[PDB]
Amino acid sequence: NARVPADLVIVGDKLVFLEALERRVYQATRVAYPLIGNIDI
Amino acid sequence: AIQQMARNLRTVLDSFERGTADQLLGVLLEKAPPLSLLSPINKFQPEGH
Numbered sequence: 001n002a003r004v005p006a007d008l009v010i011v012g013d014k015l016v017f018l019e020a021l022e023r024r025v026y027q028a029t030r031v032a033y034p035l036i037g038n039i040d041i
Numbered sequence: 042a043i044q045q046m047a048r049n050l051r052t053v054l055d056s057f058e059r060g061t062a063d064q065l066l067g068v069l070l071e072k073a074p075p076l077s078l079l080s081p082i083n084k085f086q087p088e089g090h
Binding site: 026028029031032033 | 087
């Protein structure tokens, strides 16, 4: 195992990660970030 | 006369140190785009093209 700087939050009774990877990945590239999907109404 | 020289040249030498910050403020104000344009340009546009 290795020590890694990463935030951990508590939701309900479960300890989960909370990652928002937009600077480590998808920064200064030519690809669009997912989770910005569209809807049709 | 020598004392008037000393006082006058004292203020003159202080004037350059006082005006360097003025020139920096002017050249930074001529170089700064507005925030109301720059923030959604760098946020709502991910990469470019």
